[PDB]
Amino acid sequence: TLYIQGQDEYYMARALKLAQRGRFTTHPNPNVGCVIVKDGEIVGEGYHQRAGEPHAEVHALRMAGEKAKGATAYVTLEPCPPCCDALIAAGVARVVASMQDPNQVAGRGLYRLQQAGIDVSHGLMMSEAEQLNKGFLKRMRTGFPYIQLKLGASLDGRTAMASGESQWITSPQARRDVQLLRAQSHAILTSSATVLADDPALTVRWSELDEQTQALYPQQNLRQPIRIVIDSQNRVTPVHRIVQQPGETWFARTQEDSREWPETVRTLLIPEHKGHLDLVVLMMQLGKQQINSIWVEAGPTLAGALLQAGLVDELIVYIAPKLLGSDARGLCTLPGLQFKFKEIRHVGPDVCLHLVGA
Amino acid sequence: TLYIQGQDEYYMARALKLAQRGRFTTHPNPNVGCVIVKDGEIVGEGYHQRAGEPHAEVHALRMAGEKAKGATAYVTLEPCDALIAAGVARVVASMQDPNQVAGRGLYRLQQAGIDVSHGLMMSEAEQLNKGFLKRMRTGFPYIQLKLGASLDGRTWITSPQARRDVQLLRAQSHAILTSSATVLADDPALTVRWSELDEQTQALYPQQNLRQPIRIVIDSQNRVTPVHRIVQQPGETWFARTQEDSREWPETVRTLLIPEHKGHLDLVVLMMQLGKQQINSIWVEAGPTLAGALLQAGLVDELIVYIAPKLLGSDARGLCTLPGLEKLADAPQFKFKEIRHVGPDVCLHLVGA
C-alpha cells in the first residue's frame, strides 16, 4: 500500500490543479476538481467553472461514460441533485476525497457511498484542499468572509494620497499582480473617501493578466468582482466612475439615500456603533449574502479600523524601493495594544509580503 | 586549449573562498587569498588573517617551497620579493589593484619572464572588499544602515533570530556607529558576542581571535557619561564631539573633533574624517532621525531593513513621522537585492544603484 500511496498522491494532485482553473469564476460556489482513473489511465476529468453550471463530478462522469464502472474517483471535496446517486449510477468502486464537508452534522456523504459497496477514504492532501477555498471555507464555519487587506508602501513607510487608482501601485509587475489577486476575489471593498478623491473604477482589466489569460479566463467569461463601497454619509454620487462599470456595486449605508441609481446598484443598511457604521455587522451581512472573500483597497483610516477590529485574515503588503516625504501620509497609526509571515516574493523591482492572521 | 580558462575557474574559486576566511579579523587590511597549483595538486594555500600578519603569499610559499617552481599562482589581488625567488612560472591575479598610482606589480613579474593574466572572476573580488575598495577610491568608508521596523513604518523588539543575524553582520564590520540618543535610551554594549555566531564559530573565528568592532558615538553635547556600559566594554570607543570634554575617561576612549553644521555635527566631514582614520566599513545602529539624516546626506551605501509581524502604537515614531526629510525624493535611490526569512521576521536588503 506504498505504491498506491504515491499513485493516489499523483491523481489527487491533478484533481486539485484542475479545481483551480475555476478560481476566477466560481463564486459563491467552492472550487472542486474531479479525476476518474480506470486501470491506471484517466478516463474522465472535470471541475467547477461558473456558478449555475453542473458540478465537476458530473462532467467527469459524462466524459468517462461506461468506463466509470471499474474503479476510482479522486474528488477534491466530499461529494455532496442527487449527486451521490450520479456516482452510484456510473458504478465506481472506490472514491478518495480530500476533505469532508465543512458543515458539522453534514459529514455523512461518505457513509452513503460506503453503503453501496464503494470503498472510501478522506484526508489525503487535505491541507491543500483547505488552501483552495480559504474564503468559502471560512464563510461556512464562521459567519464571515475571508478579508484580504492590501497595503502599498515606500521604503520610508509612506503611501500615495489623492493620486488616482493608476498610481496606487507603481511598477507594471506589481500592478499586474494586484490585478491577478483582485480577479480571484468575490468582492472588492473600499471606502467613500477613496472613491471621492480618486474616482476609481475598481474593476479587473482582463488585458492586464499573465498566462491565466489562456488558463481559464477566456475574455468573455470575465467576471467582475462585486464592488462594495462604505459610506454612512451618503456622499458618493450616481455619476462617479465606480457605478458605471459592468458588474454590481453595493453601498453600505447607515440610512437610505433617495436619488435614482442604475439597476445594478444595491444598498445594504447597517446599524451605527460609536459614531460610524458597524464594521462587524457589515461583515456578517456580507456573509449572509454569500460573499466568500473580500479584497480591501482602502486608505489608512479604514485599514486601521479593520485591523483594530481584528477582521483582517491576511495582509498583502507591497513595498516599493522609493523614498518620499510629507505630501503622502503614513501608512497606519494605531492606539489600542496577531500576525505571522507567510510568503515573500519579488515583484519586479517591488517586494510583496504576505502575512496571515493565524 | 580552453580547458585552461576552465581549470582556472576552479582554482581561483578556492582562492576567493580562502580570502573570506579573514573578513572578521582583517581590518584595516584587505581580504586576500592565494592558491599555488602544481601538476594538478594544490601544493600551497594561504590567506590574510590578523592586522599585521604575514601576507597570503608568504604562507602559501612557505607551505609550497621547492614545489612552487613549476606552475601557477592564483591570487585574489595584485602583489613582492619572495614570489620571484621561489620562481613561479605563471600568476593569475584577480583584480589590478585600487591604490590608482600603482598597478605595475603584475607587469614587474612579466619582467622576470613569469607569465601573467589578470581579471578572472573579478566580479566576486570586488564583492569581497567592498569597504576597503570603496575607501581607497573615494575618501569615504562603506556604510550599512540597519533599520528595524514594524508592519507600519515605525520603531531591538524584533526576534532573537534577528539579534543573532545582526551579530554576524556586526562582526564583519570595521566599526559600529550609534547616537548618544541611543546610548542614553538603551545603555547598550554594541559588542559582538562569540556565542551568538553559528558556523563561523568554526571555519575561522576561533573565540580567542574575536575582534571587537570600533565603537563610534555621535555626541555633540557630551551627554554620554563616563560610566555608561559602552565605554567599559573590551575594545575602543571613539566619541565624535563638537567640543572637547573635561571628564576623565577610561583609557580606551578616544575623541575625534568635528565642526558644527546647522545645529549638529557634520556627518559628511565625519565620514571623510573616519576614512583618513583607516576605517573600511561602518555598521549603523540608531533611530529614525540619524537614519533620516544619513539617507538625506546621501551617505548610505546599503540598507538592511528588518520588518516584524507587529503593529505598534500611535505614539510610536518611525521614518513615516518626522518633519525634516522633504528632499529625500532627491538623495540617491536604492534597489532590492535579497529578501529572506529570519525567524519570525523578514530581512530586506537594499543596495545603491
Ligand SMILES: NC(=O)c1ccc[n+]([C@@H]2O[C@H](COP(=O)([O-])OP(=O)(O)OC[C@H]3O[C@@H](n4cnc5c(N)ncnc54)[C@H](OP(=O)(O)O)[C@@H]3O)[C@@H](O)[C@H]2O)c1
Ligand atoms: N494603496 C494606495 O496607495 C491607496 C489605496 C486606496 C486609497 N488611497 C488613498 O487613501 C486616501 C483616503 O484615506 P482616508 O484615511 O482619508 O480614508 P479611507 O481610509 O480610505 O476611509 C475612511 C472611511 O472609512 C470609514 N471608516 C473609518 N473608520 C471607521 C471605523 N472606525 N469604523 C467603521 N468605519 C470607518 C469611514 O467611512 P464613512 O465616514 O463614509 O462612513 C471613513 O470616512 C485617498 O486619498 C486615497 O487616494 C491610497
Ligand SMILES: NC(=O)c1ccc[n+]([C@@H]2O[C@H](COP(=O)([O-])OP(=O)(O)OC[C@H]3O[C@@H](n4cnc5c(N)ncnc54)[C@H](OP(=O)(O)O)[C@@H]3O)[C@@H](O)[C@H]2O)c1
Ligand atoms: N539601533 C536600533 O535599531 C535601535 C535599538 C534600540 C533603540 N532604538 C531607538 O532609537 C531611538 C532614537 O531616537 P531618535 O530618532 O531621536 O535618535 P537617533 O536618530 O538615534 O539619534 C539622534 C541623534 O543623531 C544626531 N543627529 C540627528 N540629526 C542629525 C543631523 N542632521 N546631522 C548630524 N547629526 C544628527 C544627534 O546627535 P547629537 O545629540 O550628538 O546632536 C541626535 O541626537 C531611541 O528612542 C530608541 O528607542 C533603536
